[PDB]
Amino acid sequence: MRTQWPSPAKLNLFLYITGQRADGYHTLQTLFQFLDYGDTISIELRDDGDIRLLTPVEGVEHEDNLIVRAARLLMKTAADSGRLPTGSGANISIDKRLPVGGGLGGGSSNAATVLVALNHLWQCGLSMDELAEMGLTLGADVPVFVRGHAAFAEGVGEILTPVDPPEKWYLVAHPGVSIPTPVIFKDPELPRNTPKRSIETLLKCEFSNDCEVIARKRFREVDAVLSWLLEYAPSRLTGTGACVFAEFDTESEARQVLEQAPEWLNGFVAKGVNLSPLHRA
Numbered sequence: 001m002r003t004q005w006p007s008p009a010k011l012n013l014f015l016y017i018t019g020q021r022a023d024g025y026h027t028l029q030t031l032f033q034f035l036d037y038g039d040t041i042s043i044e045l046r047d048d049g050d051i052r053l054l055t056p057v058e059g060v061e062h063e064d065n066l067i068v069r070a071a072r073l074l075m076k077t078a079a080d081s082g083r084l085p086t087g088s089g090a091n092i093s094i095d096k097r098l099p100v101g102g103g104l105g106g107g108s109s110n111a112a113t114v115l116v117a118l119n120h121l122w123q124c125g126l127s128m129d130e131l132a133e134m135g136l137t138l139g140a141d142v143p144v145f146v147r148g149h150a151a152f153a154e155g156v157g158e159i160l161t162p163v164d165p166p167e168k169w170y171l172v173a174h175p176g177v178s179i180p181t182p183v184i185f186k187d188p189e190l191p192r193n194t195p196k197r198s199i200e201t202l203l204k205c206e207f208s209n210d211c212e213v214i215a216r217k218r219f220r221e222v223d224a225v226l227s228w229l230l231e232y233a234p235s236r237l238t239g240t241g242a243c244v245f246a247e248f249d250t251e252s253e254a255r256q257v258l259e260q261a262p263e264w265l266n267g268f269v270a271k272g273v274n275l276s277p278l279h280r281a
């Protein structure tokens with residue numbers, strides 16, 4: 001039997017960099033919300049203990065793909081604690097709508113959906129905390145997707161406090177540039193001193209993304225897309241870019257602006273979701 005599993009995008013509704021730890025990672029205060037939009041992952045169990053991603057993701061080698069890494073991590077962890085039924089395997093295919101990169105968390109959402117689906121399908125019985133703990137080793141973006149709720153996130157992104165932001169409609173645009181996430185976080189001029197504040201202060205302050213100034217300055221493609229959207233609606237970078245979103249109250253306004261957008265916006269429209277489509281499923 002084949003099962004299908006949502007792998008939604010996320011948005012950083014705001015993103016503040018509070019410092020940088022010794023291991024190079026940055027401490028932050030950010031607010032995750034999911035989008036009801038993303039990839040679909042299909043899984044067929046194998047009985048020969050193998051893991052096969054049948055549908056390649058362009059530019060990513062099989063063994064580098066977060067789908068496969070997540071599956072093998074779960075297999076190793078379950079097997080080291082006697083929770084992996086003999087022969088547990090899987091064929092995995094993905095219908096990929098999300099960009100590879102851009103600050104939408106698509107690869108990390110793929111990792112999270114695979115952890116959750118395989119834990120269920122192999123009957124490994126691992127808890128949320130254990131999965132989120134294993135997800136974190138695959139990237140700081142992975143735990144929010146594993147836990148499945150919109151959340152105020154601190155630490156490096158793993159300290160998650162569920163919250164229910166307004167579920168606005170978003171136009172999400174992908175500038176035609178690839179920004180390696182290491183670039184932004186290694187910039188001298190990135191704010192690393194933004195004062196840590198309470199959720200109440202943050203939820204009342206205007207939402208911004210501390211990384212936007214740098215993405216905009218360094219990538220004219222990002223500045224172009226942001227400048228264009230800002231004429232229509234509040235608009236900000238998500239993640240470290242390059243994607244930018246514009247916030248709307250209704251689907252019709254968001255789609256009307258989208259119908260107007262030049263093709264170089266590479267835009268789609270989707271609704272915010274405080275419960276991940278994966279956990280809804």
Ligand SMILES: Nc1ncnc2c1ncn2[C@@H]1O[C@H](COP(=O)(O)OP(=O)(O)O)[C@@H](O)[C@H]1O
Pocket residue numbers: 057059060064065066067099100101102103104105106107108109110141181239241
């Ligand atoms: N299934 C996957 N989908 C997208 N990217 C992946 C996947 N597996 C590994 N990656 C790697 O991660 C990067 C893009 O990941 P992604 O989570 O989409 O980043 P972003 O937060 O910028 O959206 C690429 O460098 C790619 O090598």
Ligand SMILES: Nc1nc(=O)n([C@H]2CCCS2)cc1C#CCNS(=O)(=O)C1CC1
Pocket residue numbers: 012015024025026027028030105140141155156157181182185239240
């Ligand atoms: N806290 C961090 N410090 C860092 O140095 N890095 C770099 C080093 C690894 C890849 S990039 C990432 C994070 C993270 C995170 C949580 N997910 S996130 O908020 O969507 C994304 C916008 C930040």
Ligand SMILES: [Mg+2]
Pocket residue numbers: 006007008009035036037038039277
């Ligand atoms: Mg989805």
Ligand SMILES: [Mg+2]
Pocket residue numbers: 104105106107108109139141
């Ligand atoms: Mg990611």
